[PDB]
Design a protein around this ligand. Structure first.
Ligand SMILES: CCC1=C(C)/C(=C/C2=NC(=C\c3[nH]c(/C=C4\NC(=O)[C@H](C)[C@H]4CC)c(C)c3CCC(=O)O)/C(CCC(=O)O)=C2C)NC1=O
Lengths: 161, 50
């Protein structure tokens, strides 16, 4: 768990060097993008349940997975699916605020593949659900904030696949 | 000896003192010593390996 600042400090410390001009430029880049990160995080905190339910309405609804036999069939499985998608959106917001995806592979992508493979959860359908969540939130917060959200959404989909 | 045009073989100490000890023509050993330029030992010890 480290943001862009802590990773820059960790690189300069593992070097043992002081903060040179490249580290200063990286921190200036983060300190310019931080206000946009803050406003996108507020806008995403506004519409958590709406983004999640629009992602299910785009991908998972009216398909086979909500029908009998699907892994999203029962009300318990539906509630756990909404819980999993809320987790993905919340941690993508955290990784957007930090500017570093270390929290994603520390706390989402750690044992997620083995959990989903033990439960029988389809990984492709949940990857499509995360992609639709990314599409909806990029329609919500704009072009560049949607892109800096979608880089961590693509990180979650890549670590899941 | 009948093959070469002359050339300036000797200077006086006035003329050599004129041309060489000018600041751009100068070296930096020429008259007093220069000490060795090592890096600081606490920087050398603070690195990440011997
Ligand atoms: C914060 C990081 C983190 C994540 C992401 C996480 C996921 C996680 N998802 C689970 C279940 C689940 N996850 C899903 C989700 C899906 N199945 C589908 O068909 C859809 C494609 C997809 C949703 C988009 C479902 C249906 C279950 C329930 C499985 C069951 O009850 O048999 C379980 C099983 C235990 C429990 O429900 O409470 C865990 C631990 N745990 C974590 O600590």
């Amino acid at each position: 768990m480290q943001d862009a600042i802590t990773s820059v400090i960790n690189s300069a410390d593992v070097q043992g060097k002081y903060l040179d001009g490249s580290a200063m430029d990286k921190l200036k880049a983060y300190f310019t993008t931080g206000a946009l990160r803050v406003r996108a995080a507020s806008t995403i905190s506004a519409n958590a349940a709406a983004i999640v339910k629009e992602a299910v309405a785009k991908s998972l609804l009216y398909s086979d997975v909500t029908r009998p036999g699907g892994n999203m069939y029962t009300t318990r499985r539906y509630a756990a699916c909404i819980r999993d998608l809320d987790y993905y959106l919340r941690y993508a917001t955290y990784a957007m605020l930090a500017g570093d995806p270390s929290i994603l592979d520390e706390r989402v992508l750690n044992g997620l593949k083995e959990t989903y493979n033990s439960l029988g959860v389809p990984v492709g359908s949940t990857v499509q659900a995360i992609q639709a969540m990314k599409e909806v939130t990029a329609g919500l917060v704009g072009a560049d904030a949607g892109r800096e959200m979608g880089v961590y959404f693509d990180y979650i989909c890549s670590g899941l696949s | 000896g009948e093959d070469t045009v002359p050339y300036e073989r000797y200077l006086t100490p006035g003329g050599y003192s004129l041309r060489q000890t000018r600041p751009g023509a100068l070296r930096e050993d020429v008259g007093v010593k220069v000490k060795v330029e090592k890096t600081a030992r606490f920087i050398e010890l603070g690195t990440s390996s011997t």
